[PDB]
Design a protein around this ligand. Structure first.
Ligand code: CLR
Lengths: 50, 51, 38
């Protein structure tokens, strides 16, 4: 029932081209959220300061 | 109990808010402190499961 | 970016942390096994 409710309604806003509705936004790739702050493995004694 | 879905929640968000508001005030590292809230949580869970 | 230098690397240091952790855990289990007996 839920997958059909979403399919029926996803189509309703798809075929309505002009109006704007917020869609799901996902990150570009498998990367950390801030490359200027931290990496993938994080040191227990600190990044910049002890 | 595989039917449980494990994910982020509101109270966890509030705790992370408090942790950032504490690490920014004290000039501490927000994520390294989390690496110690986890190293202590492993102790806590092992002791609780043991007894 | 730029990382502060450490004497211990990440895997070495987490090995030491988990070892001290397991030592504390084992000491607590041994103490608890000592109680409820005498
Ligand atoms: C339950 C977990 C958190 C263990 C409790 C932490 C305490 C008891 C112990 C466990 C491992 C220890 C750390 C192991 C390695 C180092 C790196 C060294 O250059 C300075 C001391 C320091 C930083 C130790 C400080 C004390 C320490 C953090």
């Amino acid at each position: 029932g839920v997958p059909i409710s979403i399919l029926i309604m996803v189509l309703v806003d798809f075929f309505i081209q002009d109006t704007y509705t917020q869609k799901l936004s996902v990150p570009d790739g498998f990367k950390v959220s801030n490359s200027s702050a931290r990496g993938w493995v994080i040191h227990p004694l600190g990044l910049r300061s002890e | 109990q595989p039917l449980l879905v494990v994910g982020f929640s509101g109270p966890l968000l509030v705790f992370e808010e408090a942790f950032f508001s504490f690490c920014e005030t004290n000039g501490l590292e927000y994520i390294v402190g989390r690496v110690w809230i986890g190293f202590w949580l492993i102790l806590l869970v092992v002791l609780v499961v043991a007894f | 970016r730029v990382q502060l230098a450490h004497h211990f690397s990440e895997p070495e240091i987490t090995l030491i942390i988990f070892g001290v952790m397991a030592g504390v855990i084992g000491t607590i289990l041994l103490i608890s096994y000592g109680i409820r007996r005498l």
